[PDB]
Amino acid sequence: MAPRGFSCLLLLTSEIDLPVKRRA
Secondary structure, eight states: OOOHHHHHHHHHHHHTTSSSSOOO
């Protein structure tokens, strides 16, 4: 159960939105 589709996209939309302002 729990595919890597939602599991991956889950954290993917958390670590990438960490800075929310920083350039690089």
